[PDB]
Amino acid sequence: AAKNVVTQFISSLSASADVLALSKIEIKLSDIPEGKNVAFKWRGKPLFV
Amino acid sequence: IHFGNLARVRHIITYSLSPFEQRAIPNIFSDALPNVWRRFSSQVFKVAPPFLGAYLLYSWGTQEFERLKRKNPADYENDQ
């Protein structure tokens, strides 16, 4: 009983489902031409691919 | 410190057995239950009465309230 309840409450403090939703970004390499650089927003800051 | 200053007691002997020599829940049928009934019996007539008197009041007022929602056909007889 204790182990679970404590686990449950401790978990309450880690990233919520909405925050996790912006955790990872999947970029399509098959849409980026040579040389030309593209910036995508990832976790508030810019991401260069 | 409250153990030792409590009361003036004399000539009383008590006997008890370790819990490991006796039964945790003994005499369920010969003693336990009979007393459970004894106890229930002696209170029912003091407790139950007013709760029952409330159930009634509740039941009446709940219905009497619904009755006042239904219509009285004697208000639409002189309507031809």
Binding site: L13, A17 | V47, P49, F51, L57, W60, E64
Partner: protein, 380 residues
């Protein structure tokens, strides 16, 4: 020095002199289990409250959604939310039995323990009141509006105290943010005063069902009552959890799943079950001020019980007349509760005024009277 470090240590001596070697009557029944439950409950409310407060936002434009976000997005946020709201109920169920027990077994003769008990009740009521506003649903807003509006019925100092309490002209954001602060605060005062409660109590020690000196038969709080109290906990906890996990919205008003709206008054504005009886007494007296006073007294009357004891015996264990009168009173309360949940219409209005009338009558007239009568029947 002292041989065992449980008697000498300035801190372990405290844990010891109030939970381990503390002399308790050998015969206190299960009705003496509520004090510990109330305590555990309190520690529990505080823990779940902090967990929720860490995802809440005290603002009229975000309150309703921040709570929705907590249930929908926070790991086990729904569970923590359930336990908190339902914990408040458990808290009251426990407190009402705690009081009942005290009235039946004449514990109120321990005046300071009793008077601090009353203050704990009031603080708890104000706490649940402000806490209820936080989710900012329709009932949260109108409950806040209707109730805090009663103060303007006070003379002169009224119309002021209200707009002072609201921080404006109507229940609005400024009211919300100050309610979050109070809700976060009061529980600690409760814990504080609870310490005072137990201090006064320990002067005398516990009372017991027969109401006679238990000095000839005291027993160490541990293991007797530590085990008894822990068992009492699990016993109550099962229904609490059962109702919580299997019928979450049993006790709640659906009008609160709708964001507060100042331009739409709900059809039936009514409090949570634990305030119904008082709501009934409030509405029993038509006249804003007299209804307020009647509500006030419905609770402040508790400060008088110690003075209306006429019996020569402490408890009601051996007083059959007082016992039925007592159960009449209890049943009188279910009725007020029921009335509190019914609209203001016949037959409810009259049933309500009666129940109120009988409530104060039983406490101020009958009880002291029957006690006197009973002393004469014992030839005293």
């Amino acid at each position: 020095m002292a041989p065992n470090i449980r008697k000498s240590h300035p801190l372990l001596k405290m844990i010891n002199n109030s939970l381990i070697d503390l002399p308790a009557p050998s015969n206190i029944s299960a009705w003496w289990n509520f004090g510990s439950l109330l305590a555990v409950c309190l520690m529990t409310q505080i823990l779940t409250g902090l967990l929720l407060a860490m995802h809440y936002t005290a603002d009229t434009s975000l309150a309703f959604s921040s709570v929705a976000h907590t249930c929908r997005n926070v790991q086990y946020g729904w569970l923590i939310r359930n336990l908190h709201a339902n914990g408040a109920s458990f808290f009251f169920i426990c407190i009402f039995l705690h009081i009942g027990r005290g009235l039946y077994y004449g514990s109120y003769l321990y005046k300071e323990t009793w008077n601090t008990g009353v203050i704990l009740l009031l603080t708890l009521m104000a706490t649940a009141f402000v806490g209820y506003v936080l989710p900012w649903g329709q009932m949260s807003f109108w409950g806040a509006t209707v109730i805090t509006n009663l103060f303007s019925a006070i003379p002169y100092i009224g119309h002021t105290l209200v707009e002072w309490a609201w921080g404006g002209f109507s229940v609005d954001n400024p009211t919300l943010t100050r309610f979050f602060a109070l809700h976060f605060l009061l529980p600690f005062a409760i814990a504080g005063i609870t310490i005072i409660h137990l201090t006064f109590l320990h002067e005398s020690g516990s009372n017991n069902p027969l109401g006679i000196s238990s000095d000839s038969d005291k027993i160490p709080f541990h293991p007797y009552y530590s085990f008894k109290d822990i068992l009492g906990l699990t016993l109550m906890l099962t229904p609490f959890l059962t109702l919580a996990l299997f019928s979450p919205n049993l006790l709640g008003d659906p009008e609160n799943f709708t964001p507060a709206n100042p331009l739409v008054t709900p059809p039936h504005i009514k409090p949570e079950w634990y305030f119904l009886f008082a709501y009934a007494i409030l509405r029993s007296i038509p006249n804003k001020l007299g209804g307020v006073l009647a509500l006030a007294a419905s609770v402040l009357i508790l400060f008088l019980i110690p003075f209306l004891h006429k019996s020569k015996q402490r408890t009601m264990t051996f007083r059959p007349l007082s016992q039925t009168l007592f159960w009449l009173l209890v049943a009188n309360l279910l009725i007020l509760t029921w009335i509190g949940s019914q609209p203001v219409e016949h037959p409810f209005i009259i049933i309500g005024q009666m129940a109120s009338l009988s409530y104060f009558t039983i406490l101020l007239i009958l009880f002291p009277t029957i006690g006197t009568l009973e002393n004469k029947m014992l030839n005293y």
